[PDB]
Design an enzyme around this catalytic site. Structure first.
Site, PDB file in Angstrom:
ATOM      1  N   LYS B 177       0.849  -1.081  -0.039  1.00 23.38           N
ATOM      2  CA  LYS B 177       0.053  -0.025   0.126  1.00 23.38           C
ATOM      3  C   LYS B 177       0.811   1.305  -0.019  1.00 23.38           C
ATOM      4  CE  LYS B 177      -1.309   2.857   2.607  1.00 23.38           C
ATOM      5  NZ  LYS B 177      -1.602   4.324   2.399  1.00 23.38           N
ATOM      6  N   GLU B 253      10.991   1.699  10.463  1.00 27.88           N
ATOM      7  CA  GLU B 253      12.105   2.736  10.219  1.00 27.88           C
ATOM      8  C   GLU B 253      11.242   3.688  10.431  1.00 27.88           C
ATOM      9  OE1 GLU B 253      14.529   0.105   6.876  1.00 27.88           O
ATOM     10  OE2 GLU B 253      13.199   1.840   6.262  1.00 27.88           O
ATOM     11  N   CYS B 287      14.122  11.105   5.936  1.00 28.47           N
ATOM     12  CA  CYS B 287      14.019  10.751   7.376  1.00 28.47           C
ATOM     13  C   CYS B 287      15.240  11.013   7.976  1.00 28.47           C
ATOM     14  CB  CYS B 287      13.547   9.175   7.546  1.00 28.47           C
ATOM     15  SG  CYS B 287      13.759   8.050   6.127  1.00 28.47           S
ATOM     16  N   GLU B 389      10.431  16.191  15.760  1.00 28.52           N
ATOM     17  CA  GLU B 389      10.577  16.098  14.354  1.00 28.52           C
ATOM     18  C   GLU B 389       9.905  16.944  13.569  1.00 28.52           C
ATOM     19  OE1 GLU B 389       9.422  12.351  12.142  1.00 28.52           O
ATOM     20  OE2 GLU B 389      11.706  12.320  11.488  1.00 28.52           O
TER      21      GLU B 389
END
Lengths: 490, 489, 489, 490
Positions: B177, B253, B287, B389
Site C-alpha cells: 500500500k 524505520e 527521514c 521532528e
C-alpha cells in the site's frame, strides 16, 4: 524456619509488605515465601540499570564481560547442589531431569555466550565511490539499555539464563521477573551475581505475577529498552501491545502444538527412547514436547503396543529418587487445566491407550499436583484436544500413509515451534524436516540444543531468533559507522 | 481524460467504488484519480498471495528468483523515464533528486538483493555428542508467507523497493500500500511485475489511507505473515498493536530528530556541501536529515555566515529544471504543519538566520505547498522546535565546546535514526561516530547507503535491522534442521 | 650438574648420541646441554604422530580439544616463572619484554585458539537443481595428520605456540623443532603436554639444527602432512623445495625490511613511544621491527633530535633488572652479522645519529653478544644497508615530502611483512595504511596482534595467512560433503 | 586456409618463428597451427601485466570488475558456438559433453565470481586495549600482481576460466598458457577480452609446452606473483620447486585415483546412471572420475551384469552427433599410455568385464586416438593398475563387506581428490562421506560443482582450496589494517 526469596535491586535485597507462598507440587507444601515488587520498585530497578550503564558496567570491554560470564558460570557450578535443590523443590522435577538438563544447560548458557562474545567479529563492507573515494562501513555493537526478562515456570533456570547470558554479554543491565511458581533459582542467580562482584544495578530481580504486578510493570515501563518473554502466546500478544507504546524490540518464544512424524523405516528402538522423552520429559511441560504424533500405517499398531508398555514402565514417583522419570505437574492450577483437557478428550470421543487419570500414592503426595502419562487416539485432526496446546504429559497418535499427506497434516496448525522426525531414509529425512514450518526440526533425536544456532518459533510460536549471533544482535543496538575516505587534496 | 491509478490484485487491475485525487504540490493541480481498496479487496489480495505460494512462485529456486529480481530491475530501467515522471509529479521532487537518488536507488535495490540472494550461505554448526555420535545443524530459509508493505510518501519508489526486493528474494508474496499522496511509482511497479511475468498474486497493490482503509486492513489481517513499515513512529505503535494479535514479525524505520556534529578541524568546504544536502535534500523530508546542528564554537560564526550565503544561492524553483535544488513540500497539510513549527519557533524566541516563510512566485505555484529553507538559532536543547521532528527544510544550529559535551547533547533524544559527523581527526572520527546512539553514523558524508550493511533505527526510530543478510533473515522463516548421525549399529 | 634439554617422542624423554650447548648471550656462558635428534628419532616422532591419530587423540571432539588447549594454557600459567627463566636465559631478553610479551602472548595463543575452535561454524551452501532436487554442501574439517613445526629464536615460545595451538585445535599431531639457540621453552612446553596428559605422540619435540639435522629431517619426511615455518626467507625457499616432493601444504612467515612512515601531524609523543619499540624492542630482533623510517620533512630535524635523546636514555643493561629495555643480541654469530652491517653502513657513507658500536660493561657481559641501538641517516633508498634485512637494533631514517612519494618508497622492496604509520589525519591514515604492500599495516601503534585476524607476509616475507579461521583452515583438511536430495520417487 | 592460434600480449597478437600443430584426436587431422612463445615474450607478458596494474586496471573498483566479469561472460555466451566448435575440435569431446558441461560451466565461472565479488565483505575485528583505547582491524584485499595460469587439456575452457575469473575479480593481470593440445578456447577467450575492452596487459596468452617452454618460463619468472596449476602431481612438484625461489603462493589441483563406494541399499537405477558418468564422462579424463569401485557384496554381481550391459549401450561414435556419449581420448600419446595400462592389467591377471581394446570404425577415425570403455576385476588392492592414476575410461571393481572395511580401502591411497558414495541410509551417507580423505565427497551424485564451496585435493591431489571466498583470498594479497583509536587527550 521458612526460606525467604527476596527482591534484589541495585545491589540490595528488598522485602515487601505483600508476599505470597512458594508451593511444591510434590505434596502441596509451602517451601518458601516470596516478596512481591510494586510498580515503584520496578521503576527503581529500571533506573538502577540505566545508572549502572553510567558506571563500571558501561565501561566494560567485551573481553571483561567474557570473563564475568565465566565467573558467573563457575560460581553457579560451585553452588550447583543449591540450584538443583531449589529448582526441584519449586517444580517437582525429577533428579534425572534437573541434574542432567536444567542445571547443566543453565550453567552452559553463560559459558556458550562467553565463547560467542569472545570471537564475535565486526560486520563490515567497503563502498566504492566515484573519483577514487571510498567509504568504510562497520557495525558497532552497543547495549540496548535495560532489558526486561519475564521467565517461565517450566524450565526456570535454563530459560532465565538463556536470556540473561546474552543480555549481559551485550553489556545490558537486566530486570528479571521469574514465574511466581518458580522464584528460587532466580534468587540464587542474584546471590551469584552479588558473590562474583557484578556491579550493583546490572542484575535486578523483581518478584510477582503478570497482570497488575511486576511483569506488567516491566513490559509497560517507558524506559525499558527491550522485552524478552517465553511463555503463553496470548501473553506475548499482551506484552507486544505494551511494547508498542515505545516501539520496543521484542523477542518471543511462545509454546506450540508440535508434531512427531515416525516412518516405518525408523530405527524403532531409538525412536521409542526418543519419543518417550519428547512426550513425557518434564511431565510434558517442555514447550518443545510433541502432542501430535503421526505414525506411518504399517508400524502404527506396533508403535501403540510398544509405547503403552514403555509408559507402564515409566517411573512416576518420588522426584528425589535417582531413577524416577516423571514428577508432578507444576501446580494444582495447571493440573486442573490438564485434567480438563483429559475430560474434553473423553467428551470428544477419544480412545485412551494409556493413562488419563491421576496416580494414587496413599500419602501426602496426593495433595500434590500429579497426573498420569497419557496417550489418546481415534480423533480427527480437527478435534480440540488435537489442536489446542495442553502442555502436559499427553499426545494424540494417528496413522498416516504418505509423505505429502503427513507434511500437510504436521504443518496444519497456527503454531510452529518444533518437530521431530524419525526415518533412516537419507533423502526423506532432509526433505521432510526442512518442510516442517517450525523453528527447530529434529531428525532421529529431540531436544538437542546447539546454542550457536538460530532458535525460535514460527507463527503464533514466536517472533525473532536467538542463539549464537542472533542473540547478540537482538540484545545489542547496532550502529553502522560509515566513514568516507577522501582522495588526497591538492 | 484523466490518469487512473488502479489496484492490482491476483494479476488483475481493479477499479473501486471509492476514489480520491493525487495532487501535485508544485501547483496543487490534479495528477490522477486513485482507486481505494476496500477490506474485501485487501482480503482477496492476501488470499491471492497465499495461493501464489502453492503455485509457480512457491516452487521457485533461489537462482530463479535472482533472475526475477534482475528482470524486474531491467524493465524498470527500460521504463526509467516513466518512473521519473510519476515520482516527480506526485512529490514535487527536483529532477536533480529524483534522477540521481529516487529512481537509480529504487532500481538498485532489486539488483543488490539479487546479488545477496545469489551468494547467501547456509548457517550451520556441528554438535558433537558422546559415543562418537554427532548432529549436523543447518538453517533452512523459507518464505514467511504474505508480507504486508506500507510505504511512505517521502521516498515512494526507493523505500518501496527497499522492502519489496528482499521480500520477493525470500520467496514471499507481497501486499503493498503506497502512501495516498504518492501512488504513482507503486502502480508503475505493478505494471513492471505484470510485464515481466511475475506470477499472479505474488505482487499485489492496494491503494488508500491508513485508518479505516487499506493500511489498517493489511495491518490487522490475521493471515498477513509479516509487516514492514516506514513512516511516523506513532503509526508504528498502532501497526505494532495490530500485529500483536497474531504475534506477527514487524520491521520498522520511523523517522527521528537527527544530529549533525561539526568540529573546527573539519574540511570546511566538503562539510558545507554535505550539510546543504543533510539539511535540505528533498526539502528536508528525508527521514535521515539533520534538524539539530552542533558546531564547535571556534567556527560557529564562520559556519553561520557561510551557511546563510549558501542558502541564498539554493535554487527553490521549477522542479523540472536541471538546476533546481529544492521543490515544494509533499502536500498542503504537511506545509501547514511545517509553517506551524516555524511559528512555534518564533513563539519560543528563535533567531532566524535564513528563511522562516514561503516563497512567492506570482504564478500557479503559489497554490502549491512551498516553504523556504530555514535556519534557526538561539534556543535551548529543551525547546520544542529543537526536540520534535519537523520533517521540513529546517535545522536549529547551536555552538558546543567539548567532545564529551556534544556526544551527550547529540544523544539527548528519544529518537535514534542517524547522525553525521564532520572532522579530519582520525581518533575523534571513530570515537565520536561510534558513540552516537543511532542506526547509521556517517563521518564526513551523509546519506551514503550500502545495501549490504545493517540499517535501522534505535529507540522511537525503529525496530530491527535490514540490509544484506539482515533483510533476508527478517523476510524468511528460519528452520534449524538438526540431524543426529548415529555411529554404525 | 648441568641442565639437560632432551627430546620428547611418543611420550618418552629421549637423550642422544649427539649433543650441543645452549649458551646465554648475556655473558656467553653455558645454560644447558641439548640432545640433537638423529633422522631415526625424527622418523619415530612422525610415526608416533600418525599412530596417535589412530588412538585417543583421533577420537577427540572439538569441545574436548577446546578443553585440552585451555588445560595446556592453565598449566603454562601455573609454571609461568619457569618459562620466563628459560626464555630469558636462552635469549638475553629483558624482563620487561619476556614478562609482558613472550610469556603472556605464548599462553594466550592456546586460549585464543580454544575460543576460535569453540565457535567455528560449518561452511555450507545449498545448490538448487532442476526437478525440485537440491544438494546440501557442507565442509567437514579433519586433521591434516602430522604437522612439522620449525620455530625461530627471536620469539621462541610465542611463535611456537602460534603454530602448535591451531595445529592441535585442528586435531593434528605435531613434530616441533625449536631453534638450536633457544631450546628451553619448547622443552618446558613438552613437560606441560606430559603433565596435563596430552596423549603420547600428539606432541613430539626434536632438537637440533637445520641442515643435516632435525630441521631438514622434518622438512623432507614423506609422511609429514604440512610444514609451518617462521624465519629466514631463503630457508623458507629450501623448506618449500623439500615440501614439493609430496606437494605438502606450507605456511611461512619470513622476516622483512619494514617501513615506518611518520607524518608531521602525528601525535609526536605517542609516535616516539611507539617508534622506540618498533626500532629496539627485543633489540630489533622482532621480525616486525622497522629498519626504514620515512619522516615528513617539516618534523625531520625534530624527530632526529628527540630520537637521539631517547636512545641515550634507553637502558641497555642487566636483563633481569625490571628497568632494562634492551638486552644483548641472540648470539655472537648474529652480533657479528649486525656489526658487519654497521661497518657496511660506514663504508656506504652513512651518518650515525646514534650507536654504531658495542657497549662496554667491564665485566663478563663483555663476553656476550651486545650491540648499541643505532640510527643511521644520509643514504639513498638504493644502499645495501637500507634494503637488506639486518635484524638488529638499527634503522635508516630519511625525509619525505609527499604522500604519493612515501607510499612508493615504502613499497620499494621485495619484502612485505609490516608497516607502521603515524598520523592524526583521518583520511590519510586509512588511505596510506591500506596501500602498504604488507601483511599487517598499523596506524598509530606497532606490534598489536589480534589473534583472530589474518596475519602473514607478502612477497619474500611469507606464504599464506594465519590467525582466526585462516589458521584453522590451514591446519585442517577440508572435505566438502555434497549430498543430493532427490524428490520423493 | 588453416587456423592460426596466436599469442596475445599487451593487447597485441604475436606470431612466432617456432610453431606446432593442433591435432584433433577424432581422426588425427590438423585443425590449426599454434605460435610458440619464447622466454622473451613471456617476460614481455609479465612486464605488460605489472604495467597494466599501473594503469586503468589498477584503478578499477570491485564493482567495475563485477561488471567486467559479466561483460566477459555475456560475450562468451554470444560466441558460444565458436567456443563449442573450437573445444570439440581440439579434444574430440562429444557435443553432449561440451554443450552441457564445458562451455556452460566455463561461462558460469565468470558470472559466479562476479556475484561473489559483489557481496564479499570485509574481515574485521575490534581489539580492546587498556585505558579505554581500542583498535579497529580490517583486512584490505589487493591484487597479488601477475598470476601465472597453466591450464590442462582435459577441460580446457572450464579449468582455464576457473582460475582466470577469480584472478581478474581480485584485480590481477594474468599470463595464461593453455595445454599444447588445447589452444583454441584460450585463444577465443583472448579475443573476448579484446572485444569487451579489457585493458591491454590485463589478459595475456602465451602458447607452448611445459619443460623448456612457456610453462616453465612462467613458473620460473621472478616477477610472477602467484602460480596456479591443474594437472599431473609430479609437474606440480616441479612447479613448486620453481616457486620456492621467490616463495611464490601456489594453488594446485593434481589428479587422483578416486573411489566410488556403492552400498546394497542404494537407489540402483540412479546409481547406474551416475556411475556411468563417474566412469566414462569425457572418456574418463576428468580428474574427478572414479577408477576404484567398491560394491557391497550382495549387489556385486548385479552391478557387474548391469554395468556391462550399460557399457554396451554407450554410444562411442562421431562426437558431433547429438547422442554420442563418448569420444576419443585427447591424443595418440595419451591413448598409448592408457593402452599400456590395459596391457599392465592383463599382465597383472585382471579379468576384463568390458572393453580393453580399441573401437574399429573402418574410416579415418581409426587414425584418431580412440579407446573402449573398460572395466576390470579380480585384482588385489595392491596391483599397480588399481593404485596408479590411468586417466582413461576404466575402473577396477571389487566387492566389500563392511563399512569400516570400505572406508579404510577407499582411503588407502596417497591421493585424495574426490569420492562418490551411493546409499539411501541417512546416517551411513553422512558418516562415510565425511571420513573420505578427499576434497569433495559426493553422495548419490557425482561432479556437482557449487562454485561457492571449497574445492581442492588432499595429499598428492593438491595444495589449498578454491571456490567462493577461498578463491578470492588466494588470488588476493591481504593487508590487515590495524588502527589504534586513542582516548581523547587532556
Amino acid at each position: 524456619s521458612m526460606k525467604q526469596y527476596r527482591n534484589f535491586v541495585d545491589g540490595k535485597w528488598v522485602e515487601s509488605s505483600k508476599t505470597f507462598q512458594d508451593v511444591t507440587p510434590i505434596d502441596g507444601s509451602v517451601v518458601a515465601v516470596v516478596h512481591e515488587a510494586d510498580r515503584d520498585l520496578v521503576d527503581a530497578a529500571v533506573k538502577a540499570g540505566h545508572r549502572a550503564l553510567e558506571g563500571e558496567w558501561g565501561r566494560t570491554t567485551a573481553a571483561q564481560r567474557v570473563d564475568w560470564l565465566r565467573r558467573i558460570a563457575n560460581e553457579m557450578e560451585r553452588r550447583q547442589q543449591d540450584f538443583l535443590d531449589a529448582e526441584m523443590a519449586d517444580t517437582g522435577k525429577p533428579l534425572s531431569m534437573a541434574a542432567t538438563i536444567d542445571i547443566p544447560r543453565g550453567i552452559a548458557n553463560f559459558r556458550n555466550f562467553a565463547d560467542i562474545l569472545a570471537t564475535a567479529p565486526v560486520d563490515s563492507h567497503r563502498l566504492d565511490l566515484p573519483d577514487g573515494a571510498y567509504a568504510l562501513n562497520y557495525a558497532a555493537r552497543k547495549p540496548l539499555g535495560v532489558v526486561g526478562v519475564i521467565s517461565p515456570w517450566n524450565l526456570p533456570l535454563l530459560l532465565l539464563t538463556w536470556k540473561v547470558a546474552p543480555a549481559l554479554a551485550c553489556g545490558n543491565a537486566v530486570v528479571v521477573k521469574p514465574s511466581e511458581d518458580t522464584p528460587g533459582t532466580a534468587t540464587l542467580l542474584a546471590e551469584v551475581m552479588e558473590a562474583v562482584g557484578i556491579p550493583p544495578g546490572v542484575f535486578n530481580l523483581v518478584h510477582g505475577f503478570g497482570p497488575n504486578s511486576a511483569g506488567e510493570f516491566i513490559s509497560q515501563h517507558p524506559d525499558i529498552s527491550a522485552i524478552t518473554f517465553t511463555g503463553e502466546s496470548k501473553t506475548g500478544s499482551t506484552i507486544m501491545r505494551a511494547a508498542a507504546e515505545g516501539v520496543k524490540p521484542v523477542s518471543f518464544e511462545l509454546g506450540g502444538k508440535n508434531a512427531a512424524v515416525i516412518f516405518a523405516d525408523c530405527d524403532f528402538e531409538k525412536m521409542l527412547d526418543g519419543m518417550m522423552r519428547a512426550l513425557f520429559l518434564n511431565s510434558g511441560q517442555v514447550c518443545l514436547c510433541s502432542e501430535r504424533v503421526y505414525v506411518e500405517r504399517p508400524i502404527f499398531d506396533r508403535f501403540c503396543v510398544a509405547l503403552a508398555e514403555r509408559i507402564k514402565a515409566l517411573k512416576v514417583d518420588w522426584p528425589h529418587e535417582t531413577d524416577t522419570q516423571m514428577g508432578p505437574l507444576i501446580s494444582s492450577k495447571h493440573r486442573d487445566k490438564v485434567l480438563s483437557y483429559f475430560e474434553l478428550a473423553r467428551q470428544e470421543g477419544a480412545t485412551f491407550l494409556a493413562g488419563g487419570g491421576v496416580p494414587r500414592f496413599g500419602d501426602e503426595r496426593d495433595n500434590g499436583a500429579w497426573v498420569e502419562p497419557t496417550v489418546i487416539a481415534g480423533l480427527s485432526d480437527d478435534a480440540r484436544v488435537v489442536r489446542e496446546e495442553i502442555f502436559g504429559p499427553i499426545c494424540h497418535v494417528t496413522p498416516f500413509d504418505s509423505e505429502s499427506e503427513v507434511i500437510r497434516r504436521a504443518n496444519d496448525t497456527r503454531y510452529g515451534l518444533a518437530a521431530t522426525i524419525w526415518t533412516t531414509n537419507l533423502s526423506r529425512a532432509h526433505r521432510v524436516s526442512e518442510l516442517m514450518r517450525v523453528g527447530i526440526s529434529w531428525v532421529n533425536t529431540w531436544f538437542l540444543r546447539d546454542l550457536r544456532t538460530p532458535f525460535g518459533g514460527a507463527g503464533l510460536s514466536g517472533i525473532g531468533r536467538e542463539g549464537g549471533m542472533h542473540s547478540l544482535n537482538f540484545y545489542s543496538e547496532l550502529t553502522n559507522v560509515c566513514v568516507r575516505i577522501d582522495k588526497e587534496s591538492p
